[PDB]
Design a protein around this ligand. Sequence first.
Ligand SMILES: NC(=O)[C@H]1CCCN(C(=O)[C@@H]2SCc3cccnc32)C1
Ligand SMILES: [Zn+2]
Length: 139
Amino acid sequence: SGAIYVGNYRVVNRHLATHNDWANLVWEDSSRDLLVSSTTAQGCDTIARCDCQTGVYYCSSRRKHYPVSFSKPSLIFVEASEYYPARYQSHLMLAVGHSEPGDCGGILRCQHGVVGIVSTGGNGLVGFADVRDLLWLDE
Ligand SMILES: NC(=O)[C@H]1CCCN(C(=O)[C@@H]2SCc3cccnc32)C1
Ligand SMILES: [Zn+2]
């Protein structure tokens, strides 16, 4: 679990969005596993606007942060799960690192700010949904 809170927006994995997220929907994209909802309180986070490919993510299944090298956002095949059919997920970045079911929502940050959130994983892989292209989060 986990979310980004920036301005009057809350960014979560679309597959973990709550009834309240959907009732205050701003934007969602199943192909990216992202959903943004509106908030009444001002958010605590700031978004990176950069091309970094290294950073640090929070892994809830280890209660620890790990450094990662990750690929540029791209279209990657993701196997079927209870949440989605087998499909290509866009704006996804892969890295070698631990992740397991429950770790989605953990933040990936570089020196500039929040880069994205955990969205997929595999045998020693972790995948992050990029948010750096969502310029409107800052306005
Ligand atoms: N974006 C998606 O389509 C997700 C939806 C939830 C299930 N998916 C996963 O990858 C799980 S959750 C993190 C993790 C880590 C190791 C193995 N499996 C997983 C795919
Ligand atoms: Zn950066």
